[PDB]
Design an enzyme around this catalytic site. Sequence first.
Site, PDB file in Angstrom:
ATOM      1  CG  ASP A 194      -1.784   1.333   1.353  1.00  0.00           C
ATOM      2  OD1 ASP A 194      -1.869   1.737   0.221  1.00  0.00           O
ATOM      3  OD2 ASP A 194      -2.217   1.559   2.389  1.00  0.00           O
TER       4      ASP A 194
ATOM      5  CB  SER B 252      -2.107  14.421 -13.355  1.00  0.00           C
ATOM      6  OG  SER B 252      -2.417  14.093 -14.624  1.00  0.00           O
TER       7      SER B 252
HETATM    8  O1  LIG Z   1      -8.911   9.407   2.973  1.00  0.00           O
HETATM    9  C1  LIG Z   1      -8.457   9.119   1.345  1.00  0.00           C
HETATM   10  C2  LIG Z   1      -7.143   7.910   1.641  1.00  0.00           C
HETATM   11  N1  LIG Z   1      -7.244   6.711   1.679  1.00  0.00           N
HETATM   12  C3  LIG Z   1      -5.927   6.054   1.806  1.00  0.00           C
HETATM   13  C4  LIG Z   1      -5.788   4.705   2.161  1.00  0.00           C
HETATM   14  O2  LIG Z   1      -6.242   4.605   3.432  1.00  0.00           O
HETATM   15  C5  LIG Z   1      -4.257   4.087   1.907  1.00  0.00           C
HETATM   16  N2  LIG Z   1      -4.105   3.475   0.617  1.00  0.00           N
HETATM   17  C6  LIG Z   1      -5.573   3.027   0.526  1.00  0.00           C
HETATM   18  C7  LIG Z   1      -5.496   1.548   1.157  1.00  0.00           C
HETATM   19  N3  LIG Z   1      -7.115   0.890   1.375  1.00  0.00           N
HETATM   20  C8  LIG Z   1      -6.683  -0.352   1.848  1.00  0.00           C
HETATM   21  C9  LIG Z   1      -7.584  -1.245   2.242  1.00  0.00           C
HETATM   22  C10 LIG Z   1      -8.698  -0.901   2.744  1.00  0.00           C
HETATM   23  C11 LIG Z   1      -9.495  -1.718   3.527  1.00  0.00           C
HETATM   24  C12 LIG Z   1      -9.355  -3.300   2.808  1.00  0.00           C
HETATM   25  C13 LIG Z   1     -10.468  -4.194   3.404  1.00  0.00           C
HETATM   26  F1  LIG Z   1     -11.382  -4.015   2.590  1.00  0.00           F
HETATM   27  F2  LIG Z   1      -9.713  -5.548   3.101  1.00  0.00           F
HETATM   28  F3  LIG Z   1     -10.715  -4.031   4.621  1.00  0.00           F
HETATM   29  C14 LIG Z   1      -8.151  -3.539   2.319  1.00  0.00           C
HETATM   30  C15 LIG Z   1      -7.140  -2.594   1.854  1.00  0.00           C
HETATM   31  N4  LIG Z   1      -5.368  -0.541   1.711  1.00  0.00           N
HETATM   32  O3  LIG Z   1      -4.679   0.654   1.325  1.00  0.00           O
HETATM   33  C16 LIG Z   1      -6.628   4.095   1.244  1.00  0.00           C
HETATM   34  C17 LIG Z   1      -4.738   7.084   1.604  1.00  0.00           C
HETATM   35  S1  LIG Z   1      -5.581   8.753   1.439  1.00  0.00           S
END
Ligand SMILES: OCc1nc([C@]2(O)CN[C@@H](c3nc(-c4ccc(C(F)(F)F)cc4)no3)C2)cs1
EC number: 3.4.23.22
Length: 330
Positions: free
Chosen positions: A35, A199
């Site tokens: 991530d 971008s």
């Molecule tokens: O506020 C807006 C922003 N959001 C972010 C992030 O939180 C960081 N990258 C993303 C990310 N989501 C996940 C993830 C979430 C849930 C699940 C589940 F469904 F399995 F629970 C799996 C992976 N992993 O990474 C979003 C950065 S800026």
Amino acid sequence: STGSATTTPIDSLDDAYITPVQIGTPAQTLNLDFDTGSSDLWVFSSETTASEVDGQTIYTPSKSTTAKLLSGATWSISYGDGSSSSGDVYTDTVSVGGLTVTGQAVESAKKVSSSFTEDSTIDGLLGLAFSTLNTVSPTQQKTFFDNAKASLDSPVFTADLGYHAPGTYNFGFIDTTAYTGSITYTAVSTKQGFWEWTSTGYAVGSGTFKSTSIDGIADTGTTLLYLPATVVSAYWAQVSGAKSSSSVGGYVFPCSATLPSFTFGVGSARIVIPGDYIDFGPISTGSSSCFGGIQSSAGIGINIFGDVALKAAFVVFNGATTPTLGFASK
Ligand SMILES: OCc1nc([C@]2(O)CN[C@@H](c3nc(-c4ccc(C(F)(F)F)cc4)no3)C2)cs1
């Protein structure tokens, strides 16, 4: 040193990608979601509340001869979808694709939210944003990349995500056979802890390019492409019957449609996302309404170049003293 690991979609929609990671001695292999939008390496573990574990592989620190409790350290994180997890912290040896970090903070979940429990294919997350976002308290911890950086041949990692197919995360080198043409590099701001860049604009299908600055983050952990409402409306206006649905939570389109491509600018270069990459299939089994892969960032507070965009490119995360992002077609 270098490392190279294959990353694999968890399902037929490319909802997320998992990469095998070796933790501890003897190795315990867990499939983690890399991530670039967060900075915690956390795992389902022998400490995770039993009712919240449903098919995941767990890390058991008591079976690792190299695990050590990071005494007093706790962590707690929320993600952009509302999911969350929390727990305590061990240090242990962590290897990705042959690249080893000793003393890596491995955050052991005591609690995970329902979306994590429900995803049996994701054993945890490996954050690759900047370590300033790491949630460990009272002593903030470094990401796997930050810890490995000084040992790498070059202070970089690359994401080469596949469309309905496996791809590759490389650490420490740029595979010049993995892309076509040149890599265009663009400046990164670390002020919010993300791989944040600007971008230079967009085009819909065969249309002319609209030059306009779009700040956003390169986030391998986000499934979709989230852009300003103006841009997203201009895209979906080209698809007969497409509309934003408050009940579904975003743009949907008739499954009978063929989608136009979407181009985004990287400096003077262009990355073209094929229309098929924007199709996330029926909103529910058997539905003729399909979920769009380009969605509005309004109310998120940030534009997100998630997997829909990143999988159309070979992406270099350059963690040199002045960080940059590189994009090439492939
Ligand atoms: O506020 C807006 C922003 N959001 C972010 C992030 O939180 C960081 N990258 C993303 C990310 N989501 C996940 C993830 C979430 C849930 C699940 C589940 F469904 F399995 F629970 C799996 C992976 N992993 O990474 C979003 C950065 S800026």
